[PDB]
Structure 1
Amino acid sequence: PERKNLKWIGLDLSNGKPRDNKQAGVFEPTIVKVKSLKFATEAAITILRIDDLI
């Protein structure tokens, strides 16, 4: 828990190393990505509840 600043190291989009994505790096809006996760899960439910085509 002392390393709470470590919450947000991610890959650099334009590079291949993990970077501290607040002190530097890219940001993406929380709403768009939280909705991305939500719609991804809803898709994975709607297409997985399928059983057969008749």
Structure 2
Amino acid sequence: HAASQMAKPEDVKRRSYRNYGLDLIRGKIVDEIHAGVLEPTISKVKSLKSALEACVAILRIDTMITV
């Protein structure tokens, strides 16, 4: 991904070849779009948004009063 994001923003490319994920059945790197592994955007955006609000609520605790 780091090598594919070098020529991508420059709007000049030889070959892009981005979006390579993990194939755990064969144990090799393949394109997930061609492999068929897709998740809706609403799942990933709300995941980072919910995980952050839960992490903030923990970082906001400097004191705990236990009866």
TM-score (norm 1): 0.74
Q: Which residue of 1 aligns with 2:22?
A: 11
- 1:22 lines up with 2:38 in the alignment: no
Q: Does 1:45 align with 2:50?
A: no
Runs of 4+ more than 3 Å apart: 13-16
Residues 29 and 44 of structure 1, relative CA distance in 2, 3 Å threshold: same
Q: Mark the runs of 5 or more structure 2 residues left unpaired by the alignment.
A: 1-6, 8-12
Output the CA distance in 2 between the equivalents of 1:10 and 1:49.
Answer: 35
Superposed CA RMSD in Å reads 1.7
More relative contact order, 1 or 2 (CA 8 Å, 6+ apart): 1
Q: Identify which of 39, 44, 47 aligns with 1:33.
A: 44
- State the percentage of identical aligned residues: 56
Q: Which moved more, 1:14-23 or 1:28-37?
A: 14-23
Give the Cα separation in 1 of the matches to 2:35 and 2:29: 11
